[PDB]
Amino acid sequence: FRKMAFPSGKVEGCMVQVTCGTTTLNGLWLDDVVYCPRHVICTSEDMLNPNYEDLLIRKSNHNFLVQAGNVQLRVIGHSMQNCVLKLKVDTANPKTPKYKFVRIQPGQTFSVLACYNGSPSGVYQCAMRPNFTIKGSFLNGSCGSVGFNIDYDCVSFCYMHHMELPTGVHAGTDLEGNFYGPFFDRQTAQAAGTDTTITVNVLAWLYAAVINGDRWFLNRFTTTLNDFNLVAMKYNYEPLTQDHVDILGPLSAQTGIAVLDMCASLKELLQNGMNGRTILGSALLEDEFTPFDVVRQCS
Amino acid sequence: FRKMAFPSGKVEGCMVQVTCGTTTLNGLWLDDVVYCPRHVICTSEDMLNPNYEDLLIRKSNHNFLVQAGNVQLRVIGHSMQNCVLKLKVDTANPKTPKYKFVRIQPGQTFSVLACYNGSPSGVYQCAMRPNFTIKGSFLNGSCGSVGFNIDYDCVSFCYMHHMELPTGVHAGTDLEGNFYGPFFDRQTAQAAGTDTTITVNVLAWLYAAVINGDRWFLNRFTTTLNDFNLVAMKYNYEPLTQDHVDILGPLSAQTGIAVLDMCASLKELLQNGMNGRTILGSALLEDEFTPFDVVRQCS
């Protein structure tokens, strides 16, 4: 049972290189618009406290070099929507898929197509942390890489990568340019909140374990949501809601283990540890699989 | 630091559905040939001890339904190469990429494009175990899914999925139809050998840990290859060769830690365990990252 990403083909045909002066990063080319982080227009003397409106005034269309594979797209307009730059180009991307722009919820997962110089390099599955960071694998110049989900034939873009925090986690925006979390595209001290564990996701992964025959942690007990949440909050776990219980229903039905029964199992795992046993080959509780992810991978 | 797969777009345009009677699985459509496991021509009364030559004699071109997305390809010929069926169709795939067929080495990794009914569902990174099994995430009907690597603009196909063993690991062939390992496409008792740990890959992952700031396991000591291998063999680790040392050179140079110094660190980790510490967020030693994988993800 593995971290599984969505096939990336629909996204690969949209990645382009965007250069502004000495700075190169990635852009997303949909119809006749290229989306990319606005901090591409920054210089090192601007990065500490940029005035992006003023910086964008100083730019002309010819200060933006956009390359698709190895064809130069002509920028014919440029504008700023919150923290994303929109570069209007004179050609529509013929490989534009059907798409929507979505803002996701903490705890939800998505696939990341990690790119450098406009070229895809890898694909992996990510979760949006409760504190709106992502624990990504991104090097310098990965800015403009996007996170996405696929539903039927439609790509739902939910994340554009912007920056690393000095703690090594990553921050970015939705495709309308609004940051996830309290972060800003400037080189200043920025703390993420305390990170917590996504309780509903750990429960889904214990169900995945049961589905795959790892059952040693099941116990006879049950619990109430209220008494579970009282314990969970001592171990830095997000509260479990009735909506979360309803969301776990399919996994409960497939295994015949009630949600509050699995909650009792998670409660004793927290209070006792694993005693050197593993679950699904891990010695830690995994929280980056949603209930949907588990159902898809096990159905 | 994550399990990262290659972008899958070049492979997605090659996946088709292949039905023979009640059996549906996946095929790979390259130029005017569809490759798929030959056991698609089996019935339940054939599965225990199939005579594939005789079974293929009984088939006609019209017993093979091949669907690309939702277009029916006309099979105009059929033949068997070891354990893969080659269905000649009357159209060339216009999305055929540049490709080669390669047979990989135990310990090497590849990306898997997991498919059902000819449609991509997910992509993940895999390793070929020392005993020529793969620990994949494959459900029923995943047969015909392929594993691949990308070099420059060329897809190197190395694996076609065939079957699950009752132990839950997976077996398959190269794209010329030769099984990896001692396995056969028949429903009989088949044991994989004892599985061992890919030593050079664990060393690469400790380097990845050092590159990412996890350094607690470094010690002052060094060792010889011979004395390392004497210990390693007690813990079910593959022998480390001079070729493996040379392969680890770039990682040694980037970190300034000699290979035999890291070998001394791995030797004490084996003899002492981790004392509840983790490395790269794992409490177990990870062996499915090659030195190449680490260099790519950290460069």
Ligand SMILES: CC(C)(C)c1ccc(N(C(=O)c2c[nH]cn2)[C@@H](C(=O)NC2CCCCC2)c2cccnc2)cc1
């Ligand atoms: C101008 C602004 C907003 C401060 C900025 C500066 C640099 C970048 N980083 C580019 O690599 C990069 C930038 N432009 C082209 N490449 C990197 C980045 O975030 N370092 C941060 C380090 C802490 C202090 C602030 C910046 C980066 C590294 C690894 C993974 N992701 C991104 C992103 C934003």
Ligand SMILES: CC(C)(C)c1ccc(N(C(=O)c2c[nH]cn2)[C@@H](C(=O)NC2CCCCC2)c2cccnc2)cc1
């Ligand atoms: C005919 C032959 C060679 C014995 C065979 C039979 C079934 C399949 N399996 C198909 O799912 C399938 C077959 N044809 C269409 N779908 C599955 C499979 O291997 N069960 C094995 C279980 C142990 C005993 C032998 C078969 C499968 C499940 C999960 C992931 N991977 C494959 C593969 C090969």
